[PDB]
Amino acid sequence: NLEELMRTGDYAQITNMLLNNQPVALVGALPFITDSSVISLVAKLDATV
Amino acid sequence: YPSILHPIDHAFNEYFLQHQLVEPLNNDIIFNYIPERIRNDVNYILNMD
Amino acid sequence: QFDFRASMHMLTSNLTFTVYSDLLAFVSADTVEPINAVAFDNMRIMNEL
Numbered sequence: 001n002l003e004e005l006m007r008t009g010d011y012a013q014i015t016n017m018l019l020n021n022q023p024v025a026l027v028g029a030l031p032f033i034t035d036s037s038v039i040s041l042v043a044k045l046d047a048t049v
Numbered sequence: 050y051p052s053i054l055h056p057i058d059h060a061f062n063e064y065f066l067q068h069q070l071v072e073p074l075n076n077d078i079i080f081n082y083i084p085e086r087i088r089n090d091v092n093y094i095l096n097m098d
Numbered sequence: 099q100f101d102f103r104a105s106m107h108m109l110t111s112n113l114t115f116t117v118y119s120d121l122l123a124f125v126s127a128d129t130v131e132p133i134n135a136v137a138f139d140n141m142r143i144m145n146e147l
Contacts, residue, residue: 007134008130079124092135096126
């Protein structure tokens, strides 16, 4: 829950999951970039954010 | 290193060398240096960057 | 009398190290928003809001 993470400010769990490549779902109202480039998808930019 | 010292001078210098006050420092030591009740307080986020 | 055999010693130490004083300077300490600060019982310190 991104709201709980922002309220508490404790990033240990998310940091450990991101460093260990553990599949997760960050839940919360988020803005997103719309990217129509196929080359961007092949380059796997979505995983770099 | 080789040194020339009177036995009394050697005694003093050897005591200084053998009884230095410096201890190995690491992140565990610093983390335990923080008071234990502040490390358990969820209102404070402590990180070792 | 000066005796070379009795005066020649080998002094041993470390090659180099850095001594630190302010351990807590190695700690990045942040705090939650005061509105969200909780007491020992995990409830907010001030609940009247």
